[PDB]
């Protein structure tokens, strides 16, 4: 999927877990959101449209995949494990993750 | 690409990290396995192509993936400090990583 | 050292980062975090001297730990890059773990 | 503890854990690793005691226990996840970081 498309997914599905009840409906949309990060790993901005696709801008930009990509693994193990409080307590926590990338290369 | 592809970007790049001598060698290696394993998320291999997409069975052969894509992530940060044979070391440790997917699943 | 100790260390050596001016002092800092952080994995907390050594609380309260000290890991890499910022975000979105942990156990 | 009292508790676990039967024991084990493993963090290895405490040789030694503490953490999830088997070969996993950082430092 294209990366604006990746984006609304988890928009969505964060929104989808914010309101949950229960661990499949948390579960379902971690996984969702999982796929949706990993597929935006091949995306290049608008904004570093202009830089090689292995410039240091470059680098900095997919890191934060890194770091979004390991946050909703354990979001999921606790999902997982029934903690579902704690599970929504930690897609709550990643929006910083969100909001960093989007604050340097939206 | 489809999973095949991306078995061989990601094997392919582990060769050359072995035999580089210089930290751009092993920086563009890891970059490369990086989107490889990223793209690979999204596909079903063949031993569950019976099995629904988000079936149990495809979220424990996805774990394998957050695994090593944590690894690259490690191994890259070694290169990028210019610890190029500690970021080989980090390369030979994550073939535990491939090989353990593979037994499973390949 | 006690909990408190370990409590004062990571305080203190979050404001010398907040305050820094450059990859040394960030990367002395972090190394400090991250002796503390290891270290106050053995502590019971006062408010769970209640419960067995492994309880399930405990185990809870201990995942925390594992979240600080995979997140300082990531801040000393980006520090020893010379990304002091990017090192000083990582450490201003470490509070949240502060934060969570003291919401639920101090 | 001293070093090789936490080394003796790492190895003794993970034949614990080789010869387990179920999640109990899979996680108990896990979590006698788990702390013996933050609590090595503090350790000066016999073969780095004429160098400063945070030399570089220092911290570089004390990366591999970022990475095996890493991966307990991952462990134990799969274990609390019922996933025995897949939790052994975690463990199994394991001896990688073990065995590097043995070959180096040991
Ligand atoms: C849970 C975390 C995140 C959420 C909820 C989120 C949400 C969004 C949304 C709703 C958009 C607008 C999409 C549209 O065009 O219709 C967007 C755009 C964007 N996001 Fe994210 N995002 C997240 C994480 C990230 C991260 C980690 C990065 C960078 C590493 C990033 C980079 C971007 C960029 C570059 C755009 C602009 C291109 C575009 O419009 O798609 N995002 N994001
Ligand atoms: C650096 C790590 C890895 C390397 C070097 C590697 C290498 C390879 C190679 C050479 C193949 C042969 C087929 C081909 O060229 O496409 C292959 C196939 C495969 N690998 Fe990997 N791999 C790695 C990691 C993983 C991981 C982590 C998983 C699962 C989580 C995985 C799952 C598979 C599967 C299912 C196949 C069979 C593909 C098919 O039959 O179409 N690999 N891999
Ligand atoms: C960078 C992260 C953190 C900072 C800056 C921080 C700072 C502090 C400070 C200033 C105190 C005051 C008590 C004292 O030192 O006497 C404290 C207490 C405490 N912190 Fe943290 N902390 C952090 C992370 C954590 C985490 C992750 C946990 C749990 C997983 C935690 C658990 C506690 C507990 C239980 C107390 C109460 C100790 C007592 O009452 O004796 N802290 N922390
Ligand atoms: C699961 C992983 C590991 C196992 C099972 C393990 C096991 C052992 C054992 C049985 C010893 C002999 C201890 C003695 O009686 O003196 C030892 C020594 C040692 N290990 Fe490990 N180890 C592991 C991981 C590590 C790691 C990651 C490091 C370094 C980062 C490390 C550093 C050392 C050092 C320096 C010694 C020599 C000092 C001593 O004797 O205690 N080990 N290890
Ligand atoms: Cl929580
Ligand atoms: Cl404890
Ligand atoms: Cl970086
Ligand atoms: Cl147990
Ligand atoms: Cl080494
Ligand atoms: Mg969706
Ligand atoms: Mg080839
Ligand atoms: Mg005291
Ligand atoms: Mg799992
Ligand atoms: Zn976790
Ligand atoms: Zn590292
Ligand atoms: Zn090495
Ligand atoms: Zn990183
Ligand atoms: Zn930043
Ligand atoms: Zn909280
Ligand atoms: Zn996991
Ligand atoms: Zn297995």
Request: aromatic share 4%.
């Amino acid at each position: 999927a294209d990366l604006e498309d990746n984006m609304e997914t988890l928009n969505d599905n964060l929104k989808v877990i914010e309101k949950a009840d229960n661990a499949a409906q948390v579960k379902d949309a971690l996984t969702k959101m999982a796929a949706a990060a990993a597929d935006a790993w091949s995306a290049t901005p608008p904004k570093l449209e202009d830089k090689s696709p292995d410039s240091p801008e470059m680098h900095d930009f997919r890191h934060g995949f890194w770091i979004l990509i390991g946050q909703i693994h354990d979001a999921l193990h606790l999902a997982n494990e029934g903690k579902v409080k704690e599970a929504q307590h930690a897609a709550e926590q990643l929006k910083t993750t969100c909001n960093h990338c989007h604050q340097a290369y939206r």
